[PDB]
Design an enzyme around this catalytic site. Structure first.
Site, short mmCIF file in Angstrom:
data_model
loop_
_atom_site.label_atom_id
_atom_site.label_comp_id
_atom_site.label_asym_id
_atom_site.label_seq_id
_atom_site.Cartn_x
_atom_site.Cartn_y
_atom_site.Cartn_z
N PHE A 123 48.14 52.22 20.44
CA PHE A 123 47.93 53.03 19.25
C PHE A 123 48.40 54.47 19.45
O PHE A 123 47.74 55.42 19.02
CB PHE A 123 46.47 52.99 18.83
CG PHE A 123 45.89 51.60 18.78
CD1 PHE A 123 46.53 50.60 18.07
CD2 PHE A 123 44.72 51.30 19.45
CE1 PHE A 123 46.00 49.33 18.02
CE2 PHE A 123 44.19 50.03 19.41
CZ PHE A 123 44.84 49.04 18.69
N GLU A 152 42.56 52.46 23.54
CA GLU A 152 44.01 52.29 23.55
C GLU A 152 44.72 53.47 22.89
O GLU A 152 45.59 53.30 22.03
CB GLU A 152 44.41 50.96 22.89
CG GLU A 152 45.72 50.39 23.39
CD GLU A 152 45.75 50.23 24.90
OE1 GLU A 152 44.99 49.39 25.42
OE2 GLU A 152 46.53 50.95 25.55
N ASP A 153 44.31 54.67 23.29
CA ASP A 153 44.96 55.92 22.91
C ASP A 153 44.74 56.25 21.43
O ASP A 153 45.58 56.86 20.78
CB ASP A 153 46.46 55.89 23.26
CG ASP A 153 47.14 57.23 23.09
OD1 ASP A 153 46.91 58.11 23.94
OD2 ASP A 153 47.91 57.39 22.13
N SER A 154 43.59 55.84 20.88
CA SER A 154 43.17 56.25 19.55
C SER A 154 42.17 57.39 19.64
O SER A 154 41.65 57.70 20.71
CB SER A 154 42.56 55.07 18.79
OG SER A 154 43.51 54.05 18.55
N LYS A 156 49.11 62.33 23.27
CA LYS A 156 49.13 62.09 21.84
C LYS A 156 48.20 60.94 21.47
O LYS A 156 47.78 60.16 22.32
CB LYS A 156 50.56 61.79 21.36
CG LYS A 156 51.19 60.58 22.01
CD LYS A 156 52.66 60.48 21.65
CE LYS A 156 53.29 59.23 22.24
NZ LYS A 156 53.25 59.25 23.72
#
Ligand SMILES: [Zn+2]
Ligand SMILES: [Zn+2]
Lengths: 48, 242, 224, 80, 43, 36, 357, 302
Positions: free
Chosen positions: B23, H54-56, H187
């Site tokens: 994501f 998961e990179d959220s 990010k």
């Protein structure tokens, strides 16, 4: 570093940790290895 | 999603292993079959349950990723920095209020009765009883000399769904773990049944953290002044040999 | 008339002259809503009717010229600061209008006003500071120089080799009891035997070499 | 383009003490500036400009978010 | 421009119009995390 | 234009009496522009 | 006496500071306190569950009706607003978040700023002229806000600035109370200054086991008139109570209609004489669900299951209750729990009226 | 950020002007020459419901409504004419041919939609017909999100001819799917929007604007982001702005001790409560101001 330097720092030995910070020569050597990751990641798509 | 302000394709984080997705800004296509012939074959052949087991490495694809791997460890951990890892009846029921499965029976419990994480995990694995006994990723002889491992956390044993002892981590519940908990469930009960237990066990791991907490800070990375002198004394030995 | 109006209304020069005319009230503060108001604004700003602009030949000679002619010779640094800002704006307009008209004695006045506006910009940058702080070293009186960086130091050779010239192999873990009543006092184990012989009643005291049988902390007792 | 009316995090009415906090701060800087050009203030390496007591005198509480947004917010009037 | 130039490369006839395809009834969007959805469900 | 749009982009006309699709229009062909 | 020992303290400007004094006096000619000041209220609760206290806090934060200032469609006069930087979005975002203490929804303001000078002119909130409604005997917002700024020779004309009502959950401009303190007074705490305990919360009991019933909650209100602080804060507290009761009473109208087929209540008869009740209510938050779960659990210690799952992407609260009684007995117990909630918040009402003089 | 100081004078394509920008609490020497772009968002490094995996990230809805990372997004429509064939004007149904199905021609005024009106999908923003009776080469607004006509003008091109220039503006807030990033290269995509009462809060009332997964750090080793939070946390209470330029002398041990001197903990972690339940965590959570920046990747365009 001088010509024919004998110290291990002149050939990429980073004595410091990330939490303590790197010097200018150590950051350049780290960027030399870091750039390979970006280059090989790009190749891991086209070459594959 | 009935919310008009949502414009994204939302999916479970444990489903990213199928697509090698994350994501950070990835975009994914989606088309809904309309023909009856294509709609039949989507349900029977192309369902994601058919690829829980990888056709490449013959092992499971899905599991717990990055919050139910450490969440399951904390839930199944024997001792907490605040004593034994137990919880009252009220907080034991609160772990099952999101799994979307049928709730267990807590009638044989006083409000002051205490339940450990092994009992809570057991009530969920009774539905698909399996047999598992391995050493968790928590135990490592690299860490052994400098750690006091608990003898009830280095041996994960499950018989007939009852978690007798040990912790659950990447070795048991992690994604891509061959011979893991969800690999055994798929072999004995079907890949669709294994996917429901991945979601069900994901909720207990996440619901445990709702009031147990997990964080990383800068002091988690900082050596003590005495240990810093030991690190450079080690490095000076390397430079002395060099 | 339509093409002339479309060309001039899109000229930033026209908008700037119109703003200057709006400041002192020569034209209404609101943009024209009817063609008559647009024609009046054109007549006031450009100084010539669009019909008569096509008949003659100049264009810049009669563009608005601000009404209040303040004294810009107090822009020589000499209720003062807002008046200085007003003088800066008015002189900027007057100098831009002179530049359009190729007025004589222009470059020197341009340089003088550029110096004046540089001083005004220094003042404005003074107004635009969030602040700054330096973590001072208490021992000194200035920016902290203390760091946790690696510092090289030639260790004695006794740390790498024993009195017989063989290298050290620190592979024996020595554990001592936290409390005195626990027995035995110390246990020496290998990495494979740590989980099978060491409990929380013991603490790692020091390492030991599996060759010369010396403690790591007692390495300085060797004759260099 | 200005200091927000309310704190972005919690919503405390920062804006009603914003303008004053701006102007007053300037004089404080003028007190501590010292023989240095304005645009070189963030490079002096010898400044100790602390705004704790000013914000406290404004009545704003000791909240991290509120003081962060009050101090750090850029002003469009000062750059354009 | 030639008839045989349409064939060879990636943007050619074979690899863009025959081996690949532009289709209707399809959607694309950025993906997102949602822990309340099943592994076989998509929001 | 009674209905500005039903949030769905359509390229075809329909009959006002029954709703049957009359024809479709996406773009003008504009290939007879090169004449002789 | 559930709610005792409340203390109220306004947030005032310290004029002993020369910098603040000079800045205020030369900007707004301000030498004394503003008409509207923030107020910090600290409240001690005893013999009440933390579910109720936290629900009261949540309602006071973003579930209580509140008033803001909004611009009607077409209010921003494009024909006259010649400023190129003060867009409608920016200005209306500024206006919406000005804390107001209004008396009625009839007041209509207007903002007419003309810049006849050669310097950028700042539009403050004192330039909002009331154009409709009864004349104000006391300001409803502070005159020291910075609405915007105009370039030389520009203008900003906005009409039809009215007062809009809503709850803080839907839009943040209706948020009322900002959190300043929350603690349990019946649980001991470690000294967290020590490096041995700085990684823990501090409480000596785990949240998985503790059941505190003696709390301290401190909330700050952004805009309250100086001479009527005790009149305002009390009202706010009382308001919150009614809201909760009202919402609870909605569920009380569901259980009363369990005989007829009702969409929001589903009853099953399971095996081993077990009964199941599912209550699905749309647009409900964790407040009502948590209160219901806590009070049902208190009423039925040996209940088989209870959960209040509030789903983000479904915008609804689903309360599942499994108990080994019949349907009628389960409904009776649910009504008893609802009555307990109602009487608890009525006692809170009475204590609020009794404490703040 | 402020992409240009003369944005109102420009008709640009795909440009975003973020209203609010902040100087970082830990600034560098690069901010002496360029304007900083971003906000000092209060960030909590914690596991909260599994929506930041998961990179959220988890974003406060109140922070969105107040203008956090909010701005206006611009598009332009440049239509040209054929000399003396085509013209600008509203077509009529009984003469012009093959009008676009499901269009909306009634919003045109003298060939152009007036400035200030909201144009949605299917609306004809520019009227243009070629004289053969007439053929309709109109221009239609084919975007799902509605725009607002910001500026309309009729300039003369290099060939001395009229062409139509229209500027459409979009009121863009931070919504689910927008990409944000820290200054350390971490990010992330906005995943969940919680109200002000569902976000976690400290004992002192501090609550995060963004909730990022603690698992984003160990594999990427973005230690500068964690040190920035530790330094920036003390700067807010001390009311100062310090310099964190690369290769400057720092001592994390001394910076951590600086937190205790300001009344905080050595590690910067604080006692926090679960906003949904009111239950405190059994762990002090590391929360503090970390400078985050919104990357111009909008889910409303992709
Ligand atoms: Zn040896
Ligand atoms: Zn705040």
């Amino acid at each position: 570093y001088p010509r024919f330097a004998l110290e291990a720092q002149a050939y990429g030995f980073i004595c410091n940790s990330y939490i303590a910070g790197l010097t200018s020569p150590e950051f350049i050597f780290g960027e030399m290895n870091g750039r390979f990751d970006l280059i090989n990641k790009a190749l891991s798509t086209s070459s594959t | 999603l009935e919310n008009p302000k949502i414009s994204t394709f939302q999916m479970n984080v444990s489903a990213c292993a199928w697509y090698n997705a994350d994501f950070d800004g990835d975009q994914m296509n989606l088309w809904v079959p309309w023909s009856v012939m294509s709609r039949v074959e989507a349900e029977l052949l192309c369902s994601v349950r058919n690829w829980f087991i990888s056709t490449k490495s013959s092992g499971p694809v899905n599991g717990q990723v990055q919050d139910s791997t450490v969440g399951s460890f904390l839930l199944t951990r024997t001792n907490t920095p605040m004593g034994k890892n137990v919880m009252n009846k009220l907080h034991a029921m609160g772990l099952f209020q999101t799994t979307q499965t049928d709730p267990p029976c807590f009638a044989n419990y006083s409000p002051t009765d205490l339940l450990d994480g092994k009992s809570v995990v057991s009530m969920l694995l009774r539905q698909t009883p399996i047999n598992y006994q391995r050493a968790p990723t928590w135990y490592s002889e690299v860490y052994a000399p400098y750690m006091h491992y608990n003898k009830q956390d280095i041996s994960t044993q499950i018989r007939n769904g009852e978690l007798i002892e040990g912790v659950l981590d990447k070795k048991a519940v992690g994604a891509g773990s061959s011979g893991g908990i969800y690999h055994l469930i798929s072999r004995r009960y079907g890949p669709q049944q294994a996917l429901k237990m991945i979601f069900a066990t994901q909720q207990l791991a996440l619901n445990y953290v709702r009031n147990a907490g997990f964080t990383v800070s800068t002091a988690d990375m900082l050596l003590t002044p005495e240990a810093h002198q030991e690190v450079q004394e080690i490095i000076n030995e390397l430079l002395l040999e060099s | 008339t339509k093409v002339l109006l479309t060309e001039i209304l899109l000229d930033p020069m026209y908008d700037y002259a119109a703003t200057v005319a709006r400041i002192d009230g020569s034209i209404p503060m609101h943009k024209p809503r009817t063609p008559k108001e647009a024609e009046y604004e054109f007549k006031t700003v450009i100084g010539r009717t669009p019909a008569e602009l096509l008949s003659q030949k100049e264009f810049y000679d009669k563009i608005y010229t601000s009404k209040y002619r303040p004294d810009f010779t107090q822009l020589t640094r000499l209720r003062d600061e807002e008046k200085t800002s007003t003088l800066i704006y008015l002189r900027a307009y007057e100098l831009f209008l002179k530049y359009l008209q190729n007025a004589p004695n222009f470059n020197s006045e341009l340089a003088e006003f550029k110096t004046y506006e540089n001083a005004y910009g220094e003042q404005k940058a003074l107004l635009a500071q969030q602040g700054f702080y330096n973590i001072f070293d208490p021992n000194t009186g200035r920016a902290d120089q203390r760091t946790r960086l690696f510092e090289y130091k030639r260790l004695p050779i006794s740390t790498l080799y024993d009195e017989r010239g063989l290298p050290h192999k620190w592979t024996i873990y020595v554990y001592k009891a936290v409390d005195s009543s626990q027995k035995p006092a110390e246990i020496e184990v290998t990495r494979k035997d740590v989980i099978k012989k060491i409990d929380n009643h013991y603490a790692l005291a020091d390492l030991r070499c599996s060759v010369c049988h010396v403690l790591q902390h007692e390495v300085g007792q060797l004759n260099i | 383009m200005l200091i927000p009316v309310v704190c972005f995090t919690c919503g405390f009415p920062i804006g009603t003490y914003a303008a004053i906090f701006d102007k007053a701060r300037t004089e404080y800087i003028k007190t501590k500036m010292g023989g240095t050009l304005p645009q070189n203030i963030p490079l002096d390496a010898s400044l100790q400009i602390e705004l704790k007591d000013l914000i406290t005198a404004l009545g704003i509480p000791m909240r991290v978010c509120c003081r962060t947004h009050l101090i750090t917010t850029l002003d469009y009037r000062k750059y354009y | 421009p030639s008839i045989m130039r349409r064939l060879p490369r990636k943007e050619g006839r074979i690899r863009k119009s025959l081996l690949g395809s532009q289709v209707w009834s399809i959607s694309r969007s950025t993906i997102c995390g949602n822990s309340d959805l099943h592994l076989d469900e998509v929001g | 234009k009674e209905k500005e749009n039903n949030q769905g982009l359509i390229y075809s006309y329909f009959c006002k009496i029954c709703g049957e699709e009359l024809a479709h229009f996406i773009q003008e062909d504009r290939t007879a522009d090169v004449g002789i | 006496k559930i709610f005792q020992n409340v203390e109220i303290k306004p947030f005032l400007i310290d004029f002993s500071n020369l910098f603040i004094k000079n800045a205020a006096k030369k900007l707004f000619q301000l030498e004394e306190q503003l008409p509207l000041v923030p107020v910090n209220v600290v409240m001690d609760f005893k013999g009440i569950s933390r579910a109720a206290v936290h629900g009261l806090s949540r309602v006071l934060q973003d579930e209580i009706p509140n008033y803001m200032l909004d611009i009607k469609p077409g209010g921003y006069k494009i024909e006259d607003s010649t400023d190129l930087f003060m867009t409608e979005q920016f200005i209306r975002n500024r206006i919406n978040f000005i804390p107001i203490y209004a008396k009625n929804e009839t007041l209509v303001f207007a903002l007419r700023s003309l810049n006849n000078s050669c310097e950028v002119k700042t539009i403050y909130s004192r330039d909002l002229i009331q154009v409709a409604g009864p004349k104000l005997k006391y300001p409803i917002f502070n005159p020291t806000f910075e609405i915007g700024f105009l370039q030389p020779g520009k203008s900003l004309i906005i009409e039809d600035i009215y007062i809009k009502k809503g709850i803080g959950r839907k839009h943040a401009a209706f948020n009322l109370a900002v959190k300043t303190h929350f603690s349990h007074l019946d649980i001991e705490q470690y000294p967290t200054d020590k490096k041995e305990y700085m990684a823990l919360s501090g409480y000596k009991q785990s949240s998985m086991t503790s059941d505190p019933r003696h709390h301290r909650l401190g909330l700050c209100f952004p805009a309250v008139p100086l001479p009527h602080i005790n009149q305002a804060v009390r009202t706010y507290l009382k308001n919150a109570c009614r809201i909760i009761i009202g919402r609870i009473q909605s569920i009380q109208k569901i259980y009363e209609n369990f005989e007829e087929p009702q969409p929001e209540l589903v009853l099953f008869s399971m095996d081993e004489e077990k009964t199941k009740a599912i209550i699905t209510i749309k647009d409900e938050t964790h407040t009502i669900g948590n209160l219901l779960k806590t009070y049902i659990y208190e009423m039925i210690p040996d209940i088989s299951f209870v959960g209040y799952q509030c789903v983000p992407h479904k915008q609804e609260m689903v309360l599942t209750i499994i108990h080994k009684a019949s349907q009628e007995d389960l409904i009776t117990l649910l009504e008893k729990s609802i009555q307990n909630i109602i009487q608890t918040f009525q006692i809170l009402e009475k204590n609020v009226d009794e404490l703040i003089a | 950020g402020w992409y240009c100081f003369s944005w109102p004078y420009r008709v640009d394509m795909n440009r975003f002007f973020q209203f609010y920008n902040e100087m970082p609490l830990v600034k560098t020497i690069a901010h002496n020459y360029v304007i900083p772009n971003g906000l000092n968002t209060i960030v909590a490094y914690m596991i909260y419901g599994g929506y930041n995996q998961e990179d959220s990230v988890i974003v406060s809805q109140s922070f969105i409504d107040r203008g956090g990372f909010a701005g206006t997004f611009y598009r332009e429509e440049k239509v040209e004419l054929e000399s003396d064939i085509e013209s600008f004007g509203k077509p009529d149904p009984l003469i012009t041919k093959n009008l676009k199905p499901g269009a909306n021609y009634e919003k045109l005024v003298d060939g152009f939609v007036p400035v200030g009106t909201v144009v949605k999908k299917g609306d004809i923003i520019i009227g243009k017909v070629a004289k053969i009776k007439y053929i309709d080469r109109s221009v239609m607004y084919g975007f799902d999100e509605p725009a607002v006509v910001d500026a309309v003008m009729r300039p003369h091109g290099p060939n001395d001819e009229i062409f139509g220039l229209m500027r459409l503006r979009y009121e863009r807030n931070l919504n689910i799917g927008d990409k944000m990033s820290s200054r350390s290269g971490n990010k992330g995509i906005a995943a969940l929007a919680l109200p002000t009462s569902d976000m976690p809060f400290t004992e002192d009332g501090l609550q995060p604007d963004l909730i990022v997964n603690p698992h984003s750090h160990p594999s990427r080793m973005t230690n500068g982001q964690m040190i920035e939070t530790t330094v920036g946390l003390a700067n807010a209470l001390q009311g100062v702005v310090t310099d964190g330029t690369a290769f400057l002398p720092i001592n994390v041990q001394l910076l951590s001790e600086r937190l205790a001197q300001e009344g905080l903990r050595f590690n910067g972690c604080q006692k926090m409560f679960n906003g949904q339940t009111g239950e405190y965590f059994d762990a002090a959570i590391f929360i503090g101001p970390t400078y985050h920046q919104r990357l111009q990747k909008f889910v409303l365009d992709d």
